[PDB]
Design a protein around this ligand. Structure first.
Ligand SMILES: Nc1ncnc2c1ncn2[C@@H]1O[C@H](COP(=O)(O)O)[C@@H](O)[C@H]1O
Lengths: 519, 208, 104, 208, 208
């Protein structure tokens, strides 16, 4: 554990062992001093432009955090291809995390000339929130996760949290946390940190698409023995009067046939087209957005429960806030063009799940009578009904992996809505900070806290290893499956590769569901 | 079959210690103004009593009578049928979730596509007469499950105010709510025994 | 009691990497036409941010005030009561599923 | 015990064990050179404004001292809440003190441009007055105790003492102490110091 | 494995054992940062002067490589004379490779005055493509092999590779490689690297 001796090696690999795959990656990082060494109160209120829906109360902290909750932190594009093309399912089993080769540097600025030097005796502090005592800020799809491309050097994100608020104000229940009230390791150059974690049992992700649909599980050639009411009135001529007629479900009457199951739940969303001409001329993104109402505050249900993006033959349509959208490289933060972003599609689940932009179904609204014609209602939100079966949202190479399930008395089907695996005891937050080094103090005692510090940053490498369990395919299907493939024909550059300018980009979103399964 | 019903699980002889809002306005004369009055649930107030549980889920269906004269004169079997919508295709929810076929004293009524019907021997395939088929009844479950042809219940539609009278909504489809208890559909000698549960990520109560 | 709320589980300081549809129409002048605009959720846009969870179930009930003057002048305790219907009989859902009594 | 290796870790916690509670805290500190490396005689007398009630004779020293004699050095506000709300009494039993991760720095000033660098070979000296042979200046409610808030960085207080005086003058009985006449540990970066202490029996405080 | 301790010694010798000869050489090297830390796409096409015969698509990388594939890397002229004058044939049997005495330096430029200093805590990374998973760029007679003369100090060559192209364009089959997706050793000053290799059977060269 010396100044001149390395404390880690570079591990970035994948190994496939038939029923498992193990992924390792190492990246280089830089950490600044954040917040000037201070915790600060932050709020947003209703004054000025601001609106109720957007209020908060919280704190920002001197700490930074390590995030690897994006699939491409771990899987190279080819590796992801191996996985999706060949397996029915996968899930995480365990992980190894390492921090090594720490360098702490002090930067000196005089006279417009800046110089950087090592500070050999400085420390950084690290800890894991093993007991989940801090607010869990992973699982909100933030930036600052390790880069997809290994050669890229990245900056650690700042840590901050939120509590209860009224407008811009705190309430009694509001909580303040100091991270310095936790035990942490202090490392100088030459020291290292590691920890090991085991994933809890969780269901395999479905890397498959159904090749059957709920409404067509019968034998095409045979009638049912079960009747349905087929006629309510006679068909003679002008003489028509009420009658009761009953018929047996059959091949040409598949819609009428008795069935055992129901499609999944529905929370209907407005539909927008990629051909702008077909859209209404208003700015309806929020006004027509699909939302939930919590304590006087309205939130987009984005993306909400999983519903098929579009029905047959309507690729142009998407739910206004019902899909995941990734930026293309260098797409702008605000108001990026359609050509600048990539929209995901959940078309694969039309098979068991309702289309996002359409009704669940129809129910009766009234009681018909001789003098009252029957009336119906369109159902646009449907909660869980017995017999319902459904599929979860897909995961993407540039998508999230896990989320912490909130600690509540109850939940229903706690699969994270953005996609991924939901864990009660997810991987713990890892928090890192540079210890403050004071500049020279006054020569006579002053009680006030020191506000003059040396300027420092640190750099190092980090490693993550994850073991994934695979579910092999067992299909008896005769014909070939759909597969993810690279383009055959010539092109200006290779997809999933660098630029002339050295910039890595991921051209498209890649999902998981290529192989198929019966229902 | 249950010999008790969800709405009558109390002791008939004893009051609750729990109050409910019983009066919103005074009853003096012509002078009436708003007030708040609270009362304790009791034997003659069983409907008002506080309770622990809720009836089962609802997907309401049109009602037809075996006495044809009481039916509307249209052919409404599909147009008024209860359906689900999957990928542009509409299917009858036949027979759908289990709900009681009819309430007290109304044996004549059935859900248009909400029961199982068996043919009598040599009944025709198409357009058989009522006398040629046999209709099942799920009357036994009125005890915990909603009647097929009627609403789940009533919810508020608005916020009442001094100038706004309160308004209500009739609930015709109700998904699962905490506290709900229910019974499954019955089986018959000429009925099916089992079904394969579909291989899906999720399901709710997978009784066929 | 929870000291956090479902709608505020994020990091206040960081943007999401996920976009949402933020503009459906242009904002130029009188010339406005349809467009598609997409934005990233952030600190001042917390309502718009993508989220993993949903609030609990709802069976809505009429509201009454302890200040009588603010109530409607009718006796609406049963007529406006929240109920369930079982076999031709109506029962108050009292107290029913758990919902917060009032907001801030 | 190396330049590149840390000698301590950050411990700031509380654990409650039903009949005991253990508190740990760590803070970051800075120490200046005090007095220019010199002991100096100080007095206050009656000349000018000064009054008899306020006279003293004493010395100031190059040393600094560590003070944690304030409850909030050890208890977070919530922890204090746990204690006061639930217990009739409390008292201290034992303590552990550690000093680690020493950095000594040399500051160079030229021409209005100042630069700070490590001095790897420099030492600091520490000792405990185990035998109570020096004037005990703790217990007078001074400033310079560890901060209540863990993130705060603090400056070590200077050590000075008083003896007998007549006006601004010493008397025969007056005593002079040199701290360099005690044995002390010398630590370079990479060295650490610790000691352990046991409290004598004392009555429980009445938190009631 | 320390800052002040050497990790290697200088071996440059030849020993003749009648049926074998063993050659050892040591050279001093310098490695720059290449490509600004970036992989970059490179192509050559048919526009301008360029012709079809000369088109390519490829990448350039931040890495450098070690090349000793020239006989005079290993044989002094007199040694080569001993070999050619007296033997009918020769071939390689095995090799040992070592990297030692690493120094990483940081260069600071201000105001037209440049200064160079050690960075004690910096690393370099090394690896061998044992499984032949990268494009093999040795064997194309490039420059950058160790110098014939031992006293000469040399600069390490940059690593780049080629794939399939159409004109200046990639094709589907075109492959991109990142060297950071391999495991590599990280060494600070004071660390060293070595590996051993055995040649496969191959025919003797005909020195006749
Ligand atoms: N991503 C997830 N993480 C944790 N629990 C889940 C997740 N998705 C579903 N579940 C739960 O696991 C159950 C598995 O049910 P089954 O497939 O019938 O064995 C579901 O019904 C949910 O309660």
């Amino acid at each position: 554990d010396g100044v001149g001796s390395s404390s880690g090696n570079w591990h970035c690999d994948s190994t496939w062992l038939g029923d498992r795959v193990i992924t390792t990656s190492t990246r280089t990082w830089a950490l600044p001093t954040y917040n000037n060494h201070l915790y600060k109160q932050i709020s947003n209120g209703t004054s000025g432009g601001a609106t109720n829906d957007n209020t908060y109360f919280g704190y920002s902290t001197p700490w930074g955090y390590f995030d690897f909750n994006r699939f491409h932190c771990h899987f190279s594009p080819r590796d992801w291809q191996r996985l999706i093309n060949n397996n029915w399912g996968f899930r995480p089993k365990r992980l190894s995390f390492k921090l090594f080769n720490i360098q702490v540097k002090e930067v000196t600025q005089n006279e417009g000339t800046k110089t950087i030097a090592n500070n050999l005796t400085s420390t950084i502090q690290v800890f894991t929130d093993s007991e989940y005592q801090l607010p869990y800020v992973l699982g909100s799809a933030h930036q600052g996760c390790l880069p997809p491309f290994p050669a890229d050097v990245f900056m650690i994100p700042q840590y901050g949290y939120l509590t209860l608020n009224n407008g811009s104000q705190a309430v009694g229940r509001s909580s303040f946390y100091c991270l310095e009230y936790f035990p942490s390791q202090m490392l100088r150059t030459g020291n290292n940190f590691q920890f090991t974690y085991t994933f809890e049992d969780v269901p395999f992700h479905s890397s498959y698409a159904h090749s059957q649909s709920l409404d067509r599980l019968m034998n095409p050639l045979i009638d049912q023995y079960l009747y349905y009411l087929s006629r309510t009135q006679t068909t003679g001529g002008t003489a028509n009067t009420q009658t009761l007629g009953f018929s047996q479900g059959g091949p040409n009457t598949m819609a009428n046939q008795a069935k055992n199951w129901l499609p999944g739940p529905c929370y209907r969303q407005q539909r927008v087209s990629t051909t702008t001409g077909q859209n209404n001329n208003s700015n309806f993104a929020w006004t027509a957005g699909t939302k939930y109402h919590l304590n006087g505050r309205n939130s987009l249900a984005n993306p909400g429960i999983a519903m098929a993006t579009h029905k047959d033959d309507e690729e142009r349509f998407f739910p206004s806030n019902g899909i995941l959208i990734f930026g293309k490289q260098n797409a702008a933060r605000d108001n990026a063009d359609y050509s600048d972003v990539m929209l995901t599609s959940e078309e694969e689940i039309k098979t068991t799940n309702p289309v996002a932009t359409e009704e669940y179904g129809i129910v009766a609204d009234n009681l018909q009578q001789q003098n009252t014609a029957p009336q119906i209602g369109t159902v646009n939100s449907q909660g869980a009904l017995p017999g319902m079966v459904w599929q979860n949202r897909d995961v993407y190479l540039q998508g999230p992996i896990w989320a912490k399930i909130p600690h509540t008395d109850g939940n229903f089907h706690p699969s994270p809505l953005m996609g991924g695996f939901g864990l009660k005891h997810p991987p713990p937050q890892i928090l890192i900070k540079n210890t403050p080094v004071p500049a020279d103090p006054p020569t006579t005692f002053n009680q006030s806290k020191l506000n003059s510090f040396i300027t420092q940053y640190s750099t190092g490498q980090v490693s993550v290893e994850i073991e994934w369990e695979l579910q092999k395919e067992n299909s008896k299907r005769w014909n070939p499956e759909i597969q993810y493939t690279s383009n055959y024909y010539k092109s200006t550059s290779v997809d999933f590769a660098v630029n002339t300018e050295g910039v890595y980009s991921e051209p498209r979103p890649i999902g998981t569901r290529y192989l198929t399964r019966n229902l």
